[model samples]
Target: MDDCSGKTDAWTSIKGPKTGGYWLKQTTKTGENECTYVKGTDFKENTKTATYTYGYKDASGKLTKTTGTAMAKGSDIVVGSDTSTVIYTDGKTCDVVKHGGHTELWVHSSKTSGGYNNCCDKKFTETRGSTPANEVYKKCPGMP
Candidate 1:
């Protein structure tokens, strides 16, 4: 994945055939464990999924957004560019309207969460909490 250390810490990757969306296990700086998801329903009624995971799993969720009106499913951040700022939430029901060069999973969570699966539930329970400092507004990867 590509890391951009600009006003926002952007970690990007590429996927293909564009399934449309994915689910992610993300954490944030607040040292909280949370799951996030992003999804989209194509105009034709077809659905897709994508997953993005980064940082420590147990870390709080790191969700950022761009300031502006017209909250379109997929808006352009820059002219001649598709790199617009999107809201990242922890398992929030988000919408995806466009596709990029490729389709893949990229994750970003808090540094304290301590890697993916820190809050994963398999034959067990996944730990989670709300109202953690510096942890909020994150997006999960998947559909309801």
Candidate 2:
């Protein structure tokens, strides 16, 4: 097991490989112990899951373009890149990039609902709420 003691406040999202699509920088705050997940199938993966029917675990999902046509663009965000601009669509978008040694990821949706879970976990079901402030994930080692 990885000694992720210092990463207590961080969260992880591992795409089950070919069986695997590792999302490696990888958090959040709040004493309530909040976590989240992105779920679906037929994910068109680049470094990130480009297009899929998956949304934020508990909402009606949407399809994404090739980082083109964004309803919102969040730049230099804290998860994927030191200077990254995440594309948001009417449905959603996600981007994964190599951040130094480990990989990281971010997911966004225009319709977020009931997709909150406890931290340090990857299971996407049995969560509550429709609106989340921020959610980030990291890829594990040996995902190559």
Candidate 3:
């Protein structure tokens, strides 16, 4: 459904429970892939989007941080660095579905400018943005 009210929460809403979000892996510059634990906050209904803080942690405990926006559409929600306007879309869908008979957050295609896959165990339910519900595919590109 295109209506915002009918959509599902990829993460909890503003003032809702917070989430660890998703540890998204992507190769914007081939072979130089980085896994960023992109989290969202204070989701808004007017824009049908949310405020996101994305960053990655290093093996040395170093962090590279930044901010962006997340848009919800077509039963999926994905993030991108669109501060002024949301021009970066297409194939950037992150949806929870069945894979190997288990629930998974499939980032679908590369959007290669965006997010990737995460596995959600069977017990996973809509967090309203309050729960830690997803598990990153540690050895990614390796599907379940």
Please give the CA lDDT of all the candidate structures: 0.27, 0.26, 0.38
Please identify which of the two predictions, 2 or 3, would achieve the higher lDDT against the true structure: 3
RMSD of 2: 13.8
Tens-digit lDDT track of model 1 for 58-140:
33334332222212233222212344332222221221111232111223323213342221221011112331223333453
lDDT of 3: 0.38
Error of 3 at 107 (Å): 15
Q: Give Cα distance to truth, residue 67, candidate 3, Å.
A: 1.2
Any runs in candidate 3 off by more than 4 Å, and if so which? 1-16, 19-35, 81-119, 123-144
Model 1 alpha-carbon miss at residue 133, Å:
13
Model 3: per-residue Cα lDDT over 1-144, one tens digit each: 222222244333211224334443322122222444455576676766777665655565454567767675533445553221111212234443322223333333232234331222111343213333443434332110
TM-score of 2: 0.21
Q: What TM-score, over all chains together, does every model reach?
A: 0.23, 0.21, 0.38
Which candidate do you rate higher for TM-score, 1 or 2?
A: 1
